[PDB]
């Protein structure tokens, strides 16, 4: 999300990764459901299962691998004025609670999740531009050194 | 188990214990009935339709389901029950729970074919709502006699595995097509009856240990009647 | 408010090479002065514009060449000089200083009716690569400017009106462009998102 | 034409005049976009979706349709427009009328790609309801200029056949994929524009001879995006 700001058109496949960091005694199942770019986001647990869904627990593996098939994108300056046409909504990566958390009577009753992301080798870029990530200017302390 | 659309990952492999000896086998050498060009979709059914998570307290007494009944409502297999009337399918059952090392207890996954139910202390046959429960399933009122007068002590004649909370937390049973006729009707007949029965109740220092139990069902090799024809 | 898509077929990989990732020749300095301090002196530091500063600080060490092009906008036959002065030699401070008459440093001479001048400068860093971020101290005693490498210097150019004091007065506008070539980089580093506050260091 | 589920029988064979030279060709050698495993159903689309019968009186002035628009509502192809957003398909058009030997008149089946419409004597672009008609289709207000200022006298540059009521009563035109991008969106783009134009009006001893005209449409080789995936 910081390299692709320099460009305009992007296309490729991605790879998300999760890493659960609970205690060794803790168990529990979760669910990850994918959404195609056509419809809307799911709401309940039952309506999310009808898409591409996986069932992932804690006791066997603390890691999991998810493959995003395809993305795209552009900016589409099509009006007469300085307008910003937002790109269309694509995909949802949701997570619901299959079973409630099981902890022993010793450890804390709170766990954590961390989500990773990595692009594949089909990700291609084009039409390098500038990035609005910083801003125009701020007040510099020692603006001129060379001149004086 | 990377099957079709879904993949229940991070499971002990255990054993794909076949029920008696067999496989769904796609039903060959039958042309004297159902000549309607069976469509037999395969890659549009294999999803691992999961069920509602249940809670197993101390004084719990088990649950039961019906396999052609519980899948009438969900998914592509749920739609294909309507606008069709003949089918044949084999099943896959994955039962999995979870607990700590400090709990203790025993469960018994068992599957009965043609499990005719009954009512306690009456002379009236059970109603239509007393059978067609759907996804959620029902509850045994007398688990020692299986609500038919047959003893649970002899109930290991059926295919079964022992989920023992000291050793393991999973089980997997494959069911073939068990029916007199080759093809059948969904809305008025249920071949298998999946049921779980606690034998030893749990125990810990506190109370109300939930031990959530999850059952996942997947049809192996289904087929249907004909829907598209030339003339 | 219009949300459209287009299927995109691509096969180009050599577009994202580092050699043509940095060959764009952005502007680096814009300053005007007058003549009636009557010249322009500028150190060849690179972190003057945030469009180029953030774009440059993705890496740790790199090596390239200058390709300096001076564009001049401002008259009877104005002749200009851009005397390059590297390290070791002294910088001029007055218009008729004898550092202008020194031959030991490079110099150009060009008019206004001509197309603007163009030179290029090779790799003059005494290490094998430029040090973008310097994690140390230039000097032994405690007050050293944390983050200035003595190998980071390049030089400074000086722009001077050649002509005699004429009975007309005028104002000269000078722009500089710099095009890196033969790019070799090492050890990529994550970009800075919080805004800069000074040019001497990283503060926020 | 025994194609899939339906079969429009008892037709003069005529000519399967290809539009320019080609066939739908299933789109090979494309892996830089739409890597989502296109499903490409073939035997679940070929039905010959027929349309509403129209009436061609003496003072009638023609009709027009849009091909990705008119099939959004009907059938398995009507369902597959929803829950999908990329597709590619070739079409088949069968236009057939009927009359006695005592009538006389001439019709002109023509198909235009990217037929941008327009409005008469204004400066406002046409609304969304002035384009998305659906199954029933619209009506030309100025047939001599095709509602864009282009002359009908030069309109034989497109693929066309001449239904002449003295000679024949059928026509068949095959359309390939005519688009800049390989795949497209159904709900905001219509490639072809099917339209019929009377040139010589009818005539008989009585009035109000109906001459019912029937158009049948069938997609040849369609495909879609992906819907089922492993992980």
Residue boundaries of the structural domains of chain D:
1-231
Q: Strand B17-18 and strand B170-175: pairing?
A: parallel
Give the chain C residue nearest A11 (alpha carbons): C8
> CA–CA separation, B78 vs B92, rounded Å?
16
- CA D219 → CA C52, D12, D15, distances in Å? 55, 21, 18
> CA–CA separation, A30 vs B9, rounded Å?
11
Smallest CA–CA separation between C2 and chain D, in Å? 12
Declared resolution, Å: 4.0
User: According to the entry, how was the structure determined?
Assistant: cryo-EM
Q: Note the Cα C99 to chain centre separation in Å.
A: 22
Chain C residues touching residue D182 (CB < 8 angstroms): 7, 9
Looking at the partner chain, which of C2, C31, C54 has a beta carbon nearest the beta carbon of A147? Answer: C31
Q: Strand C40-43 and strand C156-161: pairing?
A: antiparallel
Asked if the Cβ–Cβ distance from D228 to B2 is below 8 Å, we say no
How many C-beta atoms lie closer than 10 Å to residue B54's C-beta?
19
Helix (H/G/I), strand (E/B), else coil: B210? coil
Which of D30, D31, D35 is the best residue to mutate to test the A interface, defined by the most A CB atoms within 10 Å of its own CB? D35
Which of C2, C4, C8, C9 is the best residue to mutate to test the D interface, defined by the most D CB atoms within 10 Å of its own CB? C9
- Say if CB B86 and CB B223 are below 8 A apart: no
> CA–CA separation, D157 vs D110, rounded Å?
10
> CA–CA separation, D89 vs D94, rounded Å?
17
The CATH label, of 2.60.120.20, 3.30.300.20, 2.40.340.10, 1.10.10.10, for the domain at C1-204 is: 2.60.120.20
- Say if CB A28 and CB A100 are below 8 A apart: yes
> CA–CA separation, C72 vs C112, rounded Å?
7
Phi, psi for D14 (deg, rounded to 5): 55, -135
> CA–CA separation, B21 vs B172, rounded Å?
15
Phi, psi for C97 (deg, rounded to 5): -75, 155
Q: Exposure of A74 by Cβ count < 10 A (0-12 exposed, 13-18 middle, 19+ buried)?
A: middle
Please list, in sequence order, all residues whose beta carbon lies within 8 angstroms of the beta carbon of residue D128, skipping any fewer than 6 positions away: none
- Say if CB B111 and CB B28 are below 8 A apart: no
- Say if CB B45 and CB B219 are below 8 A apart: yes
Give the chain A residue nearest C8 (alpha carbons): A11
**Residue B223 pairs with which residues in a beta bridge?**
B88
Q: Which two tokens stand for residue B19?
A: 């029920």
Residues of A with CB under 8 A from a CB of C: 2, 6, 9, 11, 72, 74, 76, 78, 85-89, 124-126, 128, 130-131, 133-135, 137-143, 145-147
- CA B32 → CA B35, B226, B228, D76, distances in Å? 7, 15, 20, 31
Looking at the partner chain, which of A27, A52, A61 has a beta carbon nearest the beta carbon of B98? Answer: A27
In this complex, the chains that touch B, judged by 3 or more CB pairs closer than 8 A, are A, D
Q: Where are the beta strands (DSSP E) in B163-209?
A: 170-175, 192-200
Asked if the Cβ–Cβ distance from C10 to A89 is below 8 Å, we say no
B42: nearest Cα among B228, B224, B227, B222: B222
Q: Which run of H or of E encompasses B78?
A: helix B75-81
Give the chain D residue nearest B46 (alpha carbons): D228
Q: Which two tokens stand for residue D54?
A: 């129209």
**Domain D1-231, CATH 2.60.120.20 — does that match?**
yes
C and A interact (at least 3 Cβ pairs within 8 A): yes
Q: Note the Cα D174 to chain centre separation in Å.
A: 10
> CA–CA separation, B117 vs B186, rounded Å?
18
- Say if CB D85 and CB A91 are below 8 A apart: no
Q: Strand B213-219 and strand B91-97: pairing?
A: antiparallel
How many C-beta atoms lie closer than 10 Å to residue C136's C-beta?
11
Q: Which two tokens stand for residue C56?
A: 């440059």
> CA–CA separation, C192 vs D93, rounded Å?
60
Asked if the Cβ–Cβ distance from B100 to A104 is below 8 Å, we say yes
Place of tokens 């490639």: D191
D165: nearest Cα among D204, D129, D118: D204
Chain A residues touching residue D84 (CB < 8 angstroms): 38
- CA D71 → CA D4, D45, D94, D112, distances in Å? 18, 11, 15, 18
Partner A contacted by C171 (CB < 8 A): no
Which of A49, A55, A98 is the best residue to mutate to test the B interface, defined by the most B CB atoms within 10 Å of its own CB? A55
Partner A contacted by C33 (CB < 8 A): no
Please list, in sequence order, all residues whose beta carbon lies within 8 angstroms of the beta carbon of residue B157, skipping any fewer than 6 positions away: none
């Amino acid at each position: 999300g910081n390299i692709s700001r320099y460009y305009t058109h992007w296309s490729g496949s991605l790879e998300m990764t999760f890493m659960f960091c609970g205690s060794f005694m803790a168990t529990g199942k979760l669910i990850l459901c994918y959404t195609p770019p056509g419809g809307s986001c799911p709401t309940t647990r039952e309506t999310a299962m009808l898409g591409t869904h996986i069932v992932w627990d804690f006791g066997l593996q603390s890691s999991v691998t998810l493959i995003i098939p395809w993305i795209s994108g552009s900016h589409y300056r099509m009006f007469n004025n300085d307008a910003k046409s937002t790109n269309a909504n694509v995909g949802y990566v949701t997570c619901f609670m299959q079973t409630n958390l099981i902890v022993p009577s010793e450890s804390s009753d709170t766990c954590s999740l961390i989500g990773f992301i990595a692009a594949k080798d089909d990700f291609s870029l084009r039409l390098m531009r500038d990035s609005p990530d910083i801003g125009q200017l701020d007040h510099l302390h020692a603006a001129e050194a060379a001149y004086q | 188990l990377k099957l079709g659309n879904s993949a229940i990952v991070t499971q002990e492999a255990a054993n794909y214990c076949c029920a008696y000896g067999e496989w769904p086998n796609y039903l060959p050498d039958h042309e004297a009935v159902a000549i309607d060009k069976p469509t037999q979709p395969e890659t549009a059914t294999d999803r691992f339709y999961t069920l509602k998570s249940v809670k197993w307290e101390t004084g719990s007494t088990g649950w039961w389901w019906k396999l052609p009944d519980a899948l009438n409502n969900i998914g592509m297999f749920g739609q294909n029950v309507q606008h069709h009337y003949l089918y044949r399918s084999g099943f896959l059952i994955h039962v999995q729970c979870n607990a700590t090392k400090f709990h203790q207890g025993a469960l018994l996954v068992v599957a009965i074919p043609e499990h005719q139910r009954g009512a306690h202390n009456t002379n009236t046959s059970p109603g239509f709502d007393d059978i067609m429960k759907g996804e959620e399933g029902g509850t045994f009122n007398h688990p020692y006699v299986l609500d038919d007068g047959t003893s649970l002590a002899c109930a290991t004649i059926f295919p079964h595995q022992w989920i023992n909370l000291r050793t393991n937390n999973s089980a997997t049973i494959v069911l073939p097509w068990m029916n007199a006729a080759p093809m059948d009707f969904p809305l008025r007949h249920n071949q298998w009856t999946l049921a779980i029965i606690p034998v030893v109740p749990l125990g810990t220092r506190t109370t109300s240990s939930m031990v959530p139990i999850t059952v996942s069902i997947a049809p192996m090799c289904c087929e249907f009647n004909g829907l598209r024809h030339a003339i | 408010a219009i949300q459209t898509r287009t299927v995109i077929n691509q096969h180009g990989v050599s577009e994202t090479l580092v050699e043509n990732f940095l060959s764009r020749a952005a502007l680096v300095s814009k300053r005007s002065f007058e003549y009636k301090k009557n010249f322009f002196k500028w150190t060849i530091n690179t972190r003057s514009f945030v469009q180029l500063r953030r774009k440059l600080e993705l890496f740790t060490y790199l090596r390239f060449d200058a390709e300096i092009t001076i564009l001049t906008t401002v008259l009877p036959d104005l002749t200009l000089q851009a005397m390059f002065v590297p390290t070791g030699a002294l910088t001029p401070e007055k218009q008729d200083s004898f550092h202008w008459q020194s031959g030991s440093n490079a110099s150009v001479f060009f008019k206004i009716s001509d197309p603007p001048a163009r030179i290029t400068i090779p790799f003059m860093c005494i290490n094998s690569a430029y040090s973008v971020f310097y994690d140390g101290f230039a000097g032994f005693e405690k007050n050293g400017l944390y983050g200035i490498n003595p190998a980071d210097t390049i030089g400074n150019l000086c722009v001077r009106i050649v002509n005699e004091h004429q009975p007309v007065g005028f104002t000269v506008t000078v722009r500089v462009y710099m095009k890196p070539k033969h790019i070799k980089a090492w050890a990529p580093r994550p970009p800075r998102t919080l805004p800069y506050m000074s040019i001497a260091n990283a503060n926020y």
